[PDB]
C-alpha cells in the first residue's frame with residue numbers, strides 16, 4: 345500500500361500511524377530524542393500490559409485486560425496504585441494525542457513505547473501491531489511489581505500474567521538501560537539506572553553487578569539499595585536478580601553481547617504489548633516504526649566506566665566468570681540526572 349505521504353506499508357490501515365508518528369516525534373519526544381518522555385513512554389507499556397491475571401480470573405474476579413489502554417482510560421484509579429507512582433503525568437502527556445488521532449489508547453501506548461525505543465541508539469528494530477480494543481474496566485491493584493518485592497514474588501507475578509519464565513523476566517528488565525528514577529529518592533528526580541540512559545546497551549547489566557558502596561542522594565528509601573556509582577540509583581529487585589542463582593547467569597549473559605540483548609528484547613517487548621490480545625486478530629504495522637540507530641563511536645559495546653574495574657564486580661554467575669571488559673580512561677564521573685518531563 346502507498347500512503348498519502350508517499351511512503352509504502354504492507355497494510356493500508358497502517359498509513360494513519362505516520363501522522364501519529366510525525367506528531368509525537370516533534371511534540372512529545374522533542375524532535376526524536378531518547379530523553380525523559382521516551383523513557384516515561386517505555387515504562388507506561390509495562391504498567392499498562394502486565395496488569396492481567398488468569399489466577400484472579402479463576403477465583404471469579406476480573407484480573408485486568410493486559411495491553412488494553414486501561415491505565416489511560418481509568419487513570420484516576422490506576423495511577424493512584426503505589427507501583428504506578430509518577431504515571432499520572434505520563435498519561436496526562438499522552439492522552440491528548442490519543443483523542444486527537446482517534447486511535448485506541450492501548451494501541452497508542454504500544455506505539456509510543458516502540459517509537460520511544462527507536463529513538464535510543466542501539467535499540468532493536470521495534471514491532472508495532474494494532475487492534476487493542478478500549479479497556480473494559482480498570483485493572484485491580486497488586487499486579488505491578490514493586491522495587492521491594494522478592495524475587496519469588498516477581499517470578500510468580502510474570503508466570504501468572506503471561507506465563508513468562510524467569511529468563512524472560514531478565515530480558516524485559518533490559519528497559520532499565522534507558523531509564524531514570526524520579527520517585528524513590530525524595531530528594532532528587534532523574535537518577536539513571538545505568539551510566540548510558542540515552543543508549544540501549546548492557547551497561548545496566550554491568551553496573552548493577554558492581555558492589556554497592558554508596559547512596560547517590562539520600563539513604564533509607566524503601567526499594568533502594570546502594571549502587572557503585574555517584575549519580576546512579578539501584579533498586580532492590582535489580583540488585584537481587586543480578587545475584588539470585590535463578591537469574592544471575594542470565595543477567596550476566598548480556599554483558600558484551602549486543603545481539604542477544606537486542607534479539608531477546610525485541611521478542612519480549614512485542615509479547616508484553618500483546619498481553620490480553622489475540623496476535624492473530626492484530627495487524628502488523630511494524631513498517632511504520634523508524635529504523636533504529638546504531639550506538640555511535642567505535643568503543644567496545646560493554647565496558648567498565650572510568651574509575652571502575654573488574655575487582656568492583658560481585659561475581660554471582662557460578663558457571664561463567666564475569667567477562668574482562670576495558671575500563672574507559674579517566675577519573676570517575678557522576679552520572680548526570682535526567683530531569684523528568686516538565687508538565
Ligand code: HEM
Pocket residue numbers: 380383384386387389390429430489490491492498516517519520522523524525526527528567579581
Ligand atoms: C520487577 C519488575 C520491575 C520493577 C520492580 C521496576 C521498578 C522500577 C522503578 C522503581 C522505577 C522508577 C519509577 C519512579 O521512580 O516513578 C522504574 C522505572 C522504569 N522502568 Fe521499571 N521496573 C520493573 C520492570 C520494568 C519493565 C519490564 C520495563 C519494560 C518496559 C520497565 C521500564 C521502565 C523504565 C523505562 C523506567 C524509567 C522511567 C523514567 O525514566 O521516567 N520496567 N522501574
Ligand SMILES: *[C@@H]1O[C@H](CO)[C@@H](O[C@@H]2O[C@H](CO)[C@@H](O)[C@H](O)[C@H]2NC(C)=O)[C@H](O)[C@H]1NC(C)=O
Pocket residue numbers: 600601603604
Ligand atoms: C551472545 O549470546 C548468543 C545467544 O546465547 C550466543 O549465540 C550462541 O553461542 C553458543 C555458544 O558459543 C552456541 O551454542 C549457539 O548456537 C549460538 N546462537 C544462539 C542464537 O543460540 C553468542 O555466543 C553470544 N555472543 C557473544 C559475543 O558472546
Ligand SMILES: *[C@H]1O[C@H](CO)[C@H](O)[C@H](O)[C@H]1NC(C)=O
Pocket residue numbers: 593594597661662663664665
Ligand atoms: C555462563 O554464561 C556463559 C555465557 O557467555 C556460558 O554460556 C555458560 O555456559 C553460562 N553458564 C550458565 C550457568 O548458564
Ligand SMILES: *[C@H]1O[C@H](CO)[C@@H](O)[C@H](O)[C@@H]1O
Pocket residue numbers: 560574575576677678679680681
Ligand atoms: C553526581 O554529579 C552529577 C552532576 O555532575 C549529578 O547529576 C548526579 O546526580 C551526582 O550527584
Ligand SMILES: [Ca+2]
Pocket residue numbers: 391392393395408409410411412413414415479483
Ligand atoms: Ca491495562
Ligand SMILES: [Ca+2]
Pocket residue numbers: 520521522538539540541542543544545546547548
Ligand atoms: Ca544504557
